[PDB]
Structures are given as structure tokens and as C-alpha cells.
């Protein structure tokens, strides 16, 4: 007894039931098997990184140390309880200065102790072929202190209390730094650089000016896309797209302070009256990507209270 003779009596209509059941089973099986295979052979997505000083930067593998400088380190420290012939690092003992050198100076550059100053007598100044490196390091420390105490202190406590250290700009390389690498020059012309000769409180304003045209807007767009790439948050990170001139997102004033800081770095250290003479950094202009490296907070930034108080924003 049936109510559908055309479906439960004839072979042609009787085949459709099995066909549909097989189709459903095949679809379910294929979906389940693909997703099981995908979720079984994939690594753990997000491994957190913890480091008591750096923000997403590491120096624990220290194979770059020759292991004999560490041997002389303890002998020096035992010989002299207090530092001798120190001109910048003040208020610290030899043990604290050695810890700073091991973790910060060598951790941030990935170089041996003999790179800058002699292991035999750590207090020597110009008796070895590496005195110039130590002088450049002292100038770097003074520059870092200036940058910390003049610009980072203006940012609100909401952003945090991160400081600037060697690893912020070096990121594990002694030399040959690459501001404006090829991977970040994707959509832009290959020879574009930040316009560091303008006054940024009004440098890149184009809205309704009527004394500019599409070329100035193009330059503004190049700068804005560079600012996007140096982070990973898109064009709305500092803006409201309904009205660009508005100051309401609270990361646009931070960008103003950052721009003024970059201009100061360009005009005081990169090339004061000539990049070749009287200028550290070998004539390399600064960039947002140099420190930020595609993140809101630079990976080389140090957590609050980590750097020495002499170099801190609040000495």
C-alpha cells in the first residue's frame, strides 16, 4: 500500500530516492573529511611571546657572545665595584651597567663585546681600532635620551609607557639598516621619500585649499598610504572617512607628535648642515616603518621602568 505509485512502483522513479540519499551522504562526507584534515594537520595559530623588557622582541639566544668576554666580565666587575671613566651612564654600579650592556646594547644589535670596546680593559677609550664605534654608541645614547625626554613624554598614559632603545631602530642588526625596503614600496613610486621639510601641523592639508591641485593630493595620498603600511589598521586608524580634517580619533595628535619627532631626527642627527660631515647615521633618513615595523607599538620598544633612569623619559 502506497500513496505515490509513480515513485514507489516504477524503477525510474525508484532510482531517484537512492540518488538523492547518495548525493546528501557524499556532500556531508566530503565536507567533514576536508575540514577534519585541515584542522588536524595545522599548527597552533597564536603562540604568545613574553619578555620582561621588550615588546614582541627577543634576545635569549646569545650565541653571538664569544663566551670569553663573559669570562672577563666577572673579573672586571669584581675588580671595580663602581664604574670608571663613564660620561653618560650615571647613578648605576658596574653590575647594573653590565646587565644593561648585555641585555640592551648587545641584545639590540646582536654583536660581541669586542665590537665596540676592548675586553681586556673595559675603560679604555682610544687605544684600539674600535674607538669610533664606542663614540658613535655614546652619541646614539644621547640621541635616545633626547628623543625619550622631548617627544615620548608628550603622549598620554593611555598609549602606555614604552621607551625607545637600541633595538627599536636596529632590530638585531649592527649596520646596514633599511628604511624604505622594497616590500613596503609596493603601490608607491620606488624613489618616494617622506617630505621632512614641511611643518606638519599644516604640512599635508589639501581640503578646500584652492591654491593646490591633484598633484598635492597625490603627494598627500602617498604619505598617507605609507602611514597605513607602517601599521596594520587601515585608513580609519587615525581618521573618520566622512570628514578627513576632523580631529576626533585621538591617534591623529599622536601622529602629529611622531611627525615632529621624525623631522627633529632628520634635521639634527641624520644631516645637520650636511649628511656627510657632522652627522651620525651615515645619511639615512628616518621612517615610520623603521621603528613601527607594521604594528601600533614598535617591537623594539621597551616596557616602562626598564631603561636606565638617565635615559628614561622621567629621570
Amino acid at each position: 500500500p502506497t500513496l505515490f505509485p509513480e515513485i514507489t512502483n516504477t524503477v525510474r522513479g525508484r532510482f531517484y530516492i537512492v540518488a538523492g540519499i547518495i548525493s546528501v551522504v557524499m556532500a556531508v562526507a566530503s565536507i567533514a573529511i576536508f575540514w577534519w584534515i585541515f584542522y588536524t594537520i595545522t599548527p597552533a595559530p597564536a603562540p604568545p611571546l613574553q619578555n620582561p623588557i621588550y615588546v614582541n622582541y627577543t634576545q635569549e639566544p646569545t650565541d653571538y657572545i664569544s663566551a670569553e668576554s663573559l669570562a672577563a666580565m666577572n673579573a672586571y666587575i669584581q675588580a671595580n665595584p663602581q664604574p670608571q671613566a663613564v660620561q653618560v651612564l650615571k647613578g648605576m654600579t658596574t653590575a647594573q651597567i653590565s646587565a644593561y650592556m648585555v641585555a640592551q646594547v648587545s641584545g639590540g644589535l646582536k654583536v660581541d663585546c669586542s665590537y665596540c670596546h676592548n675586553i681586556a680593559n673595559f675603560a679604555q677609550q682610544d687605544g684600539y681600532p674600535n674607538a669610533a664605534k664606542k663614540v658613535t654608541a655614546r652619541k646614539m645614547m644621547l640621541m635616545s635620551a633626547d628623543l625619550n625626554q622631548n617627544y615620548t613624554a608628550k603622549l598620554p598614559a593611555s598609549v602606555g609607557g614604552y621607551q625607545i632603545t637600541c633595538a627599536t631602530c636596529h632590530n638585531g642588526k649592527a649596520a646596514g639598516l633599511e628604511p624604505y625596503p622594497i616590500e613596503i614600496m609596493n603601490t608607491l613610486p620606488n624613489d618616494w621619500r617622506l617630505p621632512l621639510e614641511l611643518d606638519y601641523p599644516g604640512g599635508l592639508v589639501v581640503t578646500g585649499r584652492k591654491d593646490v591641485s591633484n598633484h598635492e593630493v597625490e603627494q598627500n595620498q602617498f604619505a598617507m598610504y605609507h602611514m597605513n603600511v607602517s601599521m596594520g589598521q587601515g585608513c580609519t586608524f587615525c581618521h573618520n572617512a566622512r570628514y578627513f580634517p576632523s580631529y576626533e580619533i585621538a591617534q591623529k595628535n599622536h601622529s602629529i607628535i611622531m611627525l615632529q619627532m621624525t623631522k627633529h631626527i632628520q634635521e639634527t642627527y641624520v644631516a645637520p648642515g650636511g649628511r656627510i660631515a657632522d652627522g651620525i647615521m651615515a645619511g639615512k633618513s628616518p621612517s615610520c616603518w623603521l621603528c613601527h615595523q607594521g604594528a601600533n607599538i614598535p617591537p623594539g620598544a621597551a616596557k616602562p621602568g626598564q631603561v636606565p633612569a638617565v635615559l628614561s623619559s622621567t629621570p
Binding site: 514507489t8 525508484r14 530516492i17
Partner: peptide, 26 residues
């Protein structure tokens, strides 16, 4: 105890499907 219940419902579904197919396919 979730996998045991999953097996139970799957077995019940298979048995019901086979029984109704045999009823129709005869």
C-alpha cells in the same frame, strides 16, 4: 559522553533509513 550519544543517534538514523527503504523497495 558526547561521542557515545553521537554514535547512538547515528545508529538510530541508519536503522530507520534502512527500515523505511526496505519497506518502500519491496
Amino acid at each position: 559522553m558526547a561521542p557515545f550519544l553521537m554514535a547512538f543517534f547515528t545508529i538510530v538514523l541508519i536503522v530507520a533509513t534502512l527500515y523505511f527503504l526496505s519497506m518502500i523497495m519491496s
